[PDB]
Amino acid sequence: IGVKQLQREIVLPGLVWTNPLTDFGGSKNDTITVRVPAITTANRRDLRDPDRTVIASELVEHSFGVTLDKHVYAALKFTDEQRTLDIRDYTKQVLMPQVSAVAYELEDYIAELIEGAPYEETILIDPADTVPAFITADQRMGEANVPTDSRRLVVGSAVAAALAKDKQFRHADWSGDQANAALREAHVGRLAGMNVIRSNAIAPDKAYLWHRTAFILAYRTPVVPEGAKAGASFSANGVALRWLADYDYSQLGDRTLLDVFTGRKVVTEVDGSFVRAVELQLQASSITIVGGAFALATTTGTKQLKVRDDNGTDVTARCTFASSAGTKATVSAAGLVTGVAAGTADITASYVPPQGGTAKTATVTVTVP
Piece of 34-42, 122-130, 186-194, 287-295 that binds another protein (CB under 8 A): 34-42
Binding test (CB under 8 A) with another protein, winner from 10, 16, 34, 228? 34
With respect to another protein, which residue has the nearer C-beta, 25 or 292?
A: 25
Asked whether position 120 contacts another protein by CB under 8 A, the answer is no
Q: Which of 337, 297, 308 is nearest to 204 (CA)?
A: 308
* Phi, psi dihedrals of residue 205, rounded to the nearest 5°: -105, 25
User: Half-sphere exposure of 254 toward its Cβ, with a 13 Å CA cutoff?
Assistant: 13
Give the x-and-dash track for 298-327 against another protein (CB under 8 A).
Answer: ------------------------------
Bridge-based pairing of strands 294-295 and 242-246 is unpaired
Tell me whether residue 227 or residue 292 sits nearer to another protein (CB atom): 227
CB 154 → another protein: shortest distance, Å?
Answer: 21
Identify residue 298 by its one-letter amino acid code: T
Kindly indicate which of the ranges 22-30, 72-80, 175-183, 245-253 contains the residues binding another protein, using the contact rule CB under 8 A: 22-30
Q: Which amino acid is at 120?
A: E
Residues 28, 240, 262, 75: what is their CA dihedral angle, to the nearest 10 degrees? -110
C-alpha to C-alpha distances, 249 to 153, 232, 253, 321, nearest whole angstrom: 50, 22, 7, 51
Q: Does residue 32 interact with another protein by CB under 8 A?
A: yes
Pairing verdict, β 239-240 and 63-67: unpaired
Extract the runs of DSSP E, i.e. beta strands, from 159-267: 190-191, 194-198, 206-211, 215-220, 235-236, 239-240, 242-246, 255-266
Q: How far is the CB of 261 from another protein (least distance, A)?
A: 16
- Site residues for another protein, 259-288, by CB under 8 A, read 267, 269-270, 275-276
Tell me which of 3, 4, 23, 52 binds another protein, using CB under 8 A.
23
From 20-28, 106-114, 316-324, 347-355, give the range in contact with another protein by CB under 8 A.
20-28
Q: In what helix (H) or strand (E) does residue 129 lie, and over which residues does it extend?
A: none
Q: Are strands 206-211 and 277-282 parallel, antiparallel or unpaired?
A: antiparallel
By CB under 8 A, tell whether 103 contacts another protein. no
| DSSP state string for 243-277 | EEEE--TTTT--EEEEEEEEEEEE---TTS---SE
Stretch that binds another protein, among 23-31, 200-208, 290-298, 301-309 (CB under 8 A): 23-31
Distance of CA 365 to the CA centre of its chain: 35
Supply angle C-alpha 306, 310, 311, rounded to 5.
95
251 interacts with another protein by CB under 8 A: no
Binding mask of the shown chain, residues 212 to 241, with x at each position contacting another protein by CB under 8 A: -x--x-------------------------
In the stretch 37-66, what mask flags binding to another protein with x, by CB under 8 A? Answer: x-x-------xx--------------x---
Instruction: Choose between 39 and 297: whose C-beta lies nearer to another protein.
Output: 39
Judged by beta carbon, residue 201 or residue 277, the one nearer another protein is 277
- Which stretches of the chain bind another protein, using CB under 8 A? 20-21, 23, 25-28, 32-37, 39, 47-48, 63, 144-146, 213, 216, 267, 269-270, 275-276
